[PDB]
Design an enzyme around this catalytic site. Structure first.
Site, PDB file in Angstrom:
ATOM      1  N   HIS A  99       0.795  -1.238   0.000  1.00  0.00           N
ATOM      2  CA  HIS A  99       0.000   0.000   0.000  1.00  0.00           C
ATOM      3  C   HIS A  99       0.830   1.293   0.000  1.00  0.00           C
ATOM      4  CE1 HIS A  99      -4.123  -1.804   0.808  1.00  0.00           C
ATOM      5  NE2 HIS A  99      -3.367  -2.788   1.254  1.00  0.00           N
ATOM      6  N   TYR A 151       0.839  -4.091  11.906  1.00  0.00           N
ATOM      7  CA  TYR A 151       0.887  -2.686  11.471  1.00  0.00           C
ATOM      8  C   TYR A 151       1.775  -1.845  12.365  1.00  0.00           C
ATOM      9  CZ  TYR A 151      -2.804  -3.558   8.033  1.00  0.00           C
ATOM     10  OH  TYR A 151      -3.536  -4.061   6.964  1.00  0.00           O
ATOM     11  N   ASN A 209     -10.779  -1.961   2.909  1.00  0.00           N
ATOM     12  CA  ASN A 209     -10.458  -1.975   1.481  1.00  0.00           C
ATOM     13  C   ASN A 209     -11.718  -1.676   0.681  1.00  0.00           C
ATOM     14  OD1 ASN A 209      -7.683  -2.519   1.074  1.00  0.00           O
ATOM     15  ND2 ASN A 209      -7.969  -4.720   1.458  1.00  0.00           N
TER      16      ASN A 209
HETATM   17  C1  HEM Z   1      -2.792 -10.991   7.531  1.00  0.00           C
HETATM   18  C2  HEM Z   1      -3.120 -10.092   6.600  1.00  0.00           C
HETATM   19  C3  HEM Z   1      -2.491  -8.679   6.495  1.00  0.00           C
HETATM   20  C4  HEM Z   1      -1.342  -8.204   7.024  1.00  0.00           C
HETATM   21  C5  HEM Z   1      -0.295  -8.966   7.874  1.00  0.00           C
HETATM   22  C6  HEM Z   1      -1.228  -6.813   6.635  1.00  0.00           C
HETATM   23  C7  HEM Z   1      -0.197  -5.963   6.954  1.00  0.00           C
HETATM   24  C8  HEM Z   1      -0.107  -4.647   6.544  1.00  0.00           C
HETATM   25  C9  HEM Z   1       0.955  -3.733   6.896  1.00  0.00           C
HETATM   26  C10 HEM Z   1       2.159  -4.092   7.796  1.00  0.00           C
HETATM   27  C11 HEM Z   1       0.716  -2.554   6.310  1.00  0.00           C
HETATM   28  C12 HEM Z   1       1.593  -1.280   6.421  1.00  0.00           C
HETATM   29  C13 HEM Z   1       1.051  -0.450   7.588  1.00  0.00           C
HETATM   30  C14 HEM Z   1       1.923   0.763   7.808  1.00  0.00           C
HETATM   31  O1  HEM Z   1       3.158   0.625   7.603  1.00  0.00           O
HETATM   32  O2  HEM Z   1       1.398   1.864   8.164  1.00  0.00           O
HETATM   33  C15 HEM Z   1      -0.528  -2.679   5.570  1.00  0.00           C
HETATM   34  C16 HEM Z   1      -1.155  -1.700   4.836  1.00  0.00           C
HETATM   35  C17 HEM Z   1      -2.513  -1.657   4.598  1.00  0.00           C
HETATM   36  N1  HEM Z   1      -3.407  -2.731   4.682  1.00  0.00           N
HETATM   37 FE1  HEM Z   1      -2.853  -4.630   5.212  1.00  0.00          FE
HETATM   38  N2  HEM Z   1      -2.342  -6.471   5.886  1.00  0.00           N
HETATM   39  C18 HEM Z   1      -3.139  -7.593   5.787  1.00  0.00           C
HETATM   40  C19 HEM Z   1      -4.343  -7.661   5.119  1.00  0.00           C
HETATM   41  C20 HEM Z   1      -5.178  -6.584   4.924  1.00  0.00           C
HETATM   42  C21 HEM Z   1      -6.626  -6.601   4.851  1.00  0.00           C
HETATM   43  C22 HEM Z   1      -7.468  -7.893   4.982  1.00  0.00           C
HETATM   44  C23 HEM Z   1      -7.044  -5.335   4.628  1.00  0.00           C
HETATM   45  C24 HEM Z   1      -8.486  -4.781   4.517  1.00  0.00           C
HETATM   46  C25 HEM Z   1      -9.510  -5.306   5.209  1.00  0.00           C
HETATM   47  C26 HEM Z   1      -5.864  -4.484   4.586  1.00  0.00           C
HETATM   48  C27 HEM Z   1      -5.840  -3.122   4.385  1.00  0.00           C
HETATM   49  C28 HEM Z   1      -4.712  -2.324   4.385  1.00  0.00           C
HETATM   50  C29 HEM Z   1      -4.699  -0.919   4.068  1.00  0.00           C
HETATM   51  C30 HEM Z   1      -5.883  -0.022   3.673  1.00  0.00           C
HETATM   52  C31 HEM Z   1      -3.250  -0.479   4.208  1.00  0.00           C
HETATM   53  C32 HEM Z   1      -2.712   0.937   3.999  1.00  0.00           C
HETATM   54  C33 HEM Z   1      -3.187   1.769   5.186  1.00  0.00           C
HETATM   55  C34 HEM Z   1      -2.838   3.184   4.831  1.00  0.00           C
HETATM   56  O3  HEM Z   1      -3.464   3.742   3.886  1.00  0.00           O
HETATM   57  O4  HEM Z   1      -1.919   3.742   5.475  1.00  0.00           O
HETATM   58  N3  HEM Z   1      -4.752  -5.281   4.756  1.00  0.00           N
HETATM   59  N4  HEM Z   1      -1.009  -3.968   5.739  1.00  0.00           N
END
Ligand code: HEM
Ligand SMILES: NC(=O)C1=CN([C@@H]2O[C@H](COP(=O)(O)OP(=O)(O)OC[C@H]3O[C@@H](n4cnc5c(N)ncnc54)[C@H](OP(=O)(O)O)[C@@H]3O)[C@@H](O)[C@H]2O)C=CC1
Ligand SMILES: NC(=O)C1=CN([C@@H]2O[C@H](COP(=O)(O)OP(=O)(O)OC[C@H]3O[C@@H](n4cnc5c(N)ncnc54)[C@H](OP(=O)(O)O)[C@@H]3O)[C@@H](O)[C@H]2O)C=CC1
Ligand SMILES: NC(=O)C1=CN([C@@H]2O[C@H](COP(=O)(O)OP(=O)(O)OC[C@H]3O[C@@H](n4cnc5c(N)ncnc54)[C@H](OP(=O)(O)O)[C@@H]3O)[C@@H](O)[C@H]2O)C=CC1
Ligand code: HEM
Ligand code: HEM
Ligand SMILES: [Cl-]
Ligand SMILES: [Cl-]
Lengths: 514, 514, 515
Positions: free
Chosen positions: B69, B351, B141
């Site tokens: 992302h 996160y 999402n």
């Molecule tokens: C086990 C599954 C998942 C893991 C381990 C994971 C992990 C992460 C991590 C570490 C980040 C970076 C956060 C940061 O550095 O600020 C991220 C970004 C993000 N994830 Fe996931 N994620 C997973 C699944 C999902 C799911 C299922 C969704 C939605 C329901 C999602 C939505 C997002 C969004 C929207 C961002 C960006 C947030 C922003 O705009 O700053 N992710 N994810």
């Protein structure tokens, strides 16, 4: 293939492995598929060690990208010397018959890591030669010149090419506001807005050291030089419209091109040539020879051949060997010196400074950054120290042991008692400084030194009618989005380059604007 | 022209300044244009203090981008409650008539910073509510589901969507090799490969929490919920070809759109709704209600209105407030809990772990990450500590002073003597774990659980014929580049969703191949 | 206890007192600080005890790299008061008649790490910040008017020799003396260090010095060379070698605690601020090179001229946030103050901010204790942990078409092309003759009495009383214990070159103790 660079590119690479995975301690991984829970529908447990290790390391894959030149790619190969230039330089890699392993990285400038290769932009052309007397880097561009002549202005230029602070958008008004208020940019902007702002591939472009450097021979005699890397594939360029189409189709067009070419055995080659200006001819050249915005005319200083280089090895691992390479114009070797080019002098500090941050204190120890010879240094410790000195070796000089000191020193004392060594030719043999005080002053003014005569000559004496028109077309396209405030300043900027170009730019801009 | 978010977005902002610049110590800068040399043609001096400071800080502007992302943009606004859901949750922000400041970041998933907004991808939809009981983030999402049901597989999916280790290229064979060997991906891949894989803007898409969460009321009673954010602008999608065209013309198309819309007063709105499943309904549902790859049928659990949110404030500074925002699904508040969704449970760790690295140990203290209420913590020190506790406050609990401990604790001792507090409802009121051992097991199998029924339902019962056709066309485009080994795997995969979709996919694929 | 001009500074960043229950860092209430969540009382710990992980993870990141060198230190805040008129010599705002300026200070040792004793024999750092109306002006000094070297190229060699052997992490007498005797320029400072002043009892009972020659420039642009002296009103008061070692064991934080207690007790320590002033035209003729750090200016040639005093009247509110994270830097100069051709000084101007960028972060300047009282107007942006940012939509580059501005020599509207020159960079310093026009590696200009040994010899022969002279030899022979046989005659020769009587007594005492 197959390839003098193999000794470099194989460093750090694991053997191929099969069977099952292990954790980072070497123990067997039970699953890469299912995490451990307290009951099938129960909560995840804290002590799924592999899960946490896998997630935590994944969380740390990214590192700061370069600023600028974030988006790039590269290869490895060989430098071959085919002519005798020993009367000019004693640098080991340039001696007759020498074959030296190399690395190269090509890049854009302004865009970040995911941005298209074929945005209009300068392209980086940065070489490392793994010489017997150390890594010699020529960190160049696909242009013989550049936008500025003082490093003090460099961060201003780069912010103006990147994104507005308020909304993260790149901005035409900002780009032209900066360029027209810093008219020394005129030469490089004219080059950038021509066909060459959009080369098709990394293979179909020249490379240049851009700055004036110095060569010193075995007698300690200096000459001024400029490097030219002439593509055997020939310049080949997209139109403005084609470059944008390709950007949408394949943001990694040039990265993919170079990889594919080397895989197919279609190894790209450049001829290595120099312009050589006698030391005592510098002060009387019609242009200041140390002003980065001034090229040396090839009528005055023809290209003199040195050898060629070939790219014949793709990296084993892109991140480890390309993202982590630390290319640095400060990586000079005996026989090569700098010059009073203020841009170059700022760069000599700036690259290692960023690399210490972007990679880490010990970035020099990574496989791709280590020279072929052993490094004998009193530097020690720091984050992630992999390599360390022989057991019990001294940490300081002068000392009572054997590790040594500088080649000017005696290895036994501090060089007190008013010891002097004299001229620091390893930095460069300097010309006259034209003053004895710390000052903020202009470059020494030569006869034809101004901001506009060189791009004017390009337009009037070099470009053909198609190139002239495409240039006006590209400029007027790139002007779309500027403010009413900026419009007249841009019209005037192009009139200063050339009145006919200026007229056509304004005409086309107004046609295209509503 | 005001926003409830004004208090938040003004945090850390300097007043407008004019006159001359200063160094970072506040002393006046002599020049932003010319560096100091020892004579006009002499070498640059080491002690141009401003030069070095300017260059050194420039060298440190970049920080690690998010994985995944990385490419995103956002705004600030207000959540407004217009219904009474106090029967279901005691969460302060959701109580009748509540108005709460918010932040939102939208994003793609796979590409780096500077990659195009309109690459086909999932789009992130991540909200922060600055509630009176802390920051509540719903990091969602533009899809109600996702690719996997176990966090152990998440890094595998994300690497497959990023670049090959050898050459830094994204790769179709890799993406399909993973998806077909992880067939739980079928639901989300069917969603992604349809029209919704290419929404035109961030305003013209729904958002979802995706995961089942828990709501707990003032009586401690739990219900299972799913969040739906229904766009008032309506879904509006590019075709595959149009999205690629926009990618080349404007890589920041969606970033620019959201900024312009807000600047123009065209504030985008989403209606906040939930699905609510009684706690006692969970074991009986035809699908496992905690399997992220399974949506709850809206015919079984219809949307229940809660209120709406509006985006009415652009950030003051993009990097400071958007790049540095730390959105985290672990940011829950009283009245909200988690669930046995293993994807969710992995995220609750992941996160903040990345944010400690990407931003720094004290990331929570940055203006955009601080809640509206004072934080009372025993955490201390760490890099870049801006905020510290009142002088002499204790660093440990239990202690003989007033600072306090947890709300279950008495504040004077360690809760020894076999003190117990009972069920951790603040995490979630758990359902039956279906076992008492640490295991690696399947989810409890419900009646209609498999990897292919729900995307099959989407295809056969929801999509119109035009959607079905563009789906096959999109898929067959995305297949270009797969190996021969991978071809029948992809055929089987789509046949398993629907045999007519699969045959149409193969047909178009072979027509285009080459 | 009532107030300090520094209260504005030390209150920055401080939370109000809080009670009730703890919260997580998102602000949500913490259930327990005592018990973690498990899947059953005897079941495994669950991953999603959010507070547990947050608490452990932040704990895991409390430590930062300590300073190299000067890791062990402590400090306070206070006020500079100007009581004389030195306006004929400098235009610096903080030094004008009647000015009261808030200050910070950090004191320290040099070689030891963060846990090490305050009273190990060592130089002590004496590092001041003045929060002036024209920026932070730091005088990062020491408790000695001189130092061990005259070229920054040798500084890391000296500091490694004062630290630990690479093989076993042990500090080493042989290494210390091997370096010192092979770098005889160190003789002046080693003599000062090995005397009583190597072990001052407290931070309050020592003088401070800028050590280097700096420059003052007045309102008409005229320069004079200056040296700063901060003369303690508490008086020098020193332990013997034995007392200092005993205190090192009894209370490793003896000096940290003393300064904190003194200020809490209302016994505010005071130093009188004075300068030596050498006319610009005197420099070439002085018997010693006036820019060589290893050479002091005689106070008989250049008497101390009074400027004012400073007082420490405020303890930090939080030690880590305000002392460990302070970023003191001799490059923090202000108008009216310049540098000099002292090569050690010139190396330092680069080195401190460089280390601070690493040990604190790219944005260290923004932390409360490092911000000046005036607003910073800069085009620098972004970087890790950016708290402060410019007003919305301000430009990121100059020259620009807006109002943010540029340097005071610039016009604010263009890049100063068309062969614009500004002339002598007096804000760095008005330079003397460089004595050459080439890039060189050369000795300092040699003055009549320049060598490595005359000044400590003068200290021994003309300044020290008989007890100081004897304790010096005794201290030296103690510090020699552990040297190798090969190193012994080098040290004998070294001390002989300072003074043959000192050398004789040092050898005599050394052999008695060997052993
Ligand atoms: C086990 C599954 C998942 C893991 C381990 C994971 C992990 C992460 C991590 C570490 C980040 C970076 C956060 C940061 O550095 O600020 C991220 C970004 C993000 N994830 Fe996931 N994620 C997973 C699944 C999902 C799911 C299922 C969704 C939605 C329901 C999602 C939505 C997002 C969004 C929207 C961002 C960006 C947030 C922003 O705009 O700053 N992710 N994810
Ligand atoms: N002197 C130098 O180091 C170079 C200068 N230039 C520009 O050319 C002008 C004349 O230089 P000089 O060497 O005296 O004259 P020359 O005629 O000897 O060289 C002209 C150069 O311009 C190059 N060129 C041709 N078309 C374009 C174009 N579309 N955009 C940019 N460059 C092009 C040529 O490459 P080719 O031979 O393949 O056609 C050739 O290297 C200069 O003002 C400078 O702006 C450009 C490149 C090198
Ligand atoms: N249950 C849920 O929360 C959602 C389910 N879906 C998909 O719909 C299927 C049926 O779910 P159910 O609620 O029982 O049936 P419903 O008929 O009640 O809902 C179908 C859902 O699919 C949405 N939809 C319409 N066209 C597309 C498309 N091109 N791509 C993706 N989604 C589209 C609809 O949105 P609209 O009203 O605008 O037409 C509606 O939300 C599921 O298998 C799932 O794949 C999709 C979104 C949410
Ligand atoms: N010139 C300077 O800036 C200083 C020089 N010195 C040393 O004094 C020598 C003579 O200098 P000059 O100014 O010509 O002579 P002065 O007689 O004018 O002053 C000698 C200085 O030495 C100080 N001193 C006294 N005892 C000791 C000791 N135990 N260890 C270190 N310093 C002590 C004195 O402090 P007090 O008046 O309190 O007794 C006085 O400041 C120099 O070679 C130098 O080593 C020391 C400090 C400052
Ligand atoms: C004063 C002017 C300039 C300064 C301060 C400067 C500084 C930098 C820095 C700090 C980097 C990042 C290096 C890294 O992190 O690895 C960089 C990248 C780069 N610069 Fe410059 N630069 C300047 C002008 C130039 C010029 C004139 C050229 C060419 C002649 C050039 C060519 C490049 C190239 C090719 C890269 C990318 C190297 C790679 O591929 O890794 N730059 N620059
Ligand atoms: C070329 C010679 C020297 C170099 C390169 C050098 C460099 C440094 C560096 C990098 C630091 C760490 C700063 C930080 O991380 O905040 C430091 C600390 C310090 N240095 Fe030096 N130094 C030199 C000689 C001197 C001299 C001659 C003096 C006194 C006149 C001095 C006084 C101090 C003091 C007092 C500190 C601690 C400041 C504090 O309390 O935070 N140093 N030095
Ligand atoms: Cl970390
Ligand atoms: Cl760093």
């Amino acid at each position: 293939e197959k390839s003098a660079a193999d000794q470099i590119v194989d460093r750090g690479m694991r053997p191929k492995l099969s069977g099952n995975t292990t954790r980072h301690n070497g123990a067997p991984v039970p699953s890469e598929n299912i995490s451990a829970t307290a009951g099938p529908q129960g909560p995840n447990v804290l002590n799924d060690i592999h899960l946490i290790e896998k997630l935590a390391h994944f969380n740390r894959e990214n590192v700061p990208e370069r600023i600028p030149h974030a988006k790039g790619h590269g290869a490895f190969g060989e430098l071959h010397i085919t002519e005798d230039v020993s009367e000019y330089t004693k640098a080991d890699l340039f001696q007759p018959g020498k074959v030296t392993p190399l690395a190269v990285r090509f890049s854009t400038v302004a865009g970040e890591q995911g941005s298209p290769d074929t945005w209009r932009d300068v392209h980086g052309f940065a070489l490392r030669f793994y010489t017997e007397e150390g890594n010699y880097d020529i960190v160049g561009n696909n242009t013989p010149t550049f936008f500025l002549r003082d490093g003090m202005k460099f961060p201003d230029f780069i912010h103006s090419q990147k994104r507005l602070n308020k909304n993260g958008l790149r901005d035409a008004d900002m780009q032209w506001d900066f360029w027209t208020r810093a008219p020394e940019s005129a030469h490089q902007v004219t080059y950038l807005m021509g066909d060459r702002g959009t080369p098709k591939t990394s293979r179909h472009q020249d490379g240049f050291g851009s700055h004036t450097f110095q060569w010193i021979n075995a007698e300690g005699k200096p000459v001024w030089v400029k490097y030219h890397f002439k593509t055997r594939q020939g310049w080949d360029c997209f139109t403005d419209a084609e470059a944008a189409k390709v950007a949408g189709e394949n943001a990694d067009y040039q990265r993919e091109d170079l990889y594919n070419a080397i895989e197919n055995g279609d190894f790209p080659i450049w001829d290595v040539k120099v312009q050589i200006m006698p030391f005592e001819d510098a002060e009387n050249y019609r242009w200041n020879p140390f002003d980065l915005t001034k090229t040396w005319s090839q009528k005055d200083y023809p290209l003199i051949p040195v050898g060629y280089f070939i790219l014949n090895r793709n990296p084993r691992n892109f991140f480890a060997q390309i993202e982590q390479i630390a290319l640095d114009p400060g990586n000079i070797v005996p026989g090569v010196g700098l010059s009073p080019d203020r841009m170059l002098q700022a760069r000599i500090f700036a690259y290692a400074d960023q690399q210490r941050y972007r990679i880490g204190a010990n970035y020099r120890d990574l496989p791709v950054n280590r020279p072929i010879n052993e490094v004998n240094t009193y530097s020690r410790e720091g984050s992630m120290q992999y390599i360390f000195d022989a057991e019990g070796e001294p940490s300081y000089s002068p000392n009572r042991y054997d590790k040594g000191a500088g080649y000017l020193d005696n290895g036994t004392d501090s060089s007190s008692n008013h010891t002097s060594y004299g001229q620091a030719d390893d930095i460069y043999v300097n010309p006259d400084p034209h003053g004895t005080d710390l000052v903020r002053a202009a470059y020494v003014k030569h006869q034809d030194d101004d901001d506009f005569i060189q791009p004017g000559i390009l337009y009037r004496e070099v470009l053909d009618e198609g190139e002239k028109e495409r240039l006006a077309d590209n400029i007027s396209n790139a002007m779309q989005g500027i403010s009413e405030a900026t419009e007249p300043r841009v019209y005037d900027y192009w009139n200063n380059v050339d009145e006919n170009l200026g007229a056509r730019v304004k005409e086309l801009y107004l046609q295209k604007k509503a």
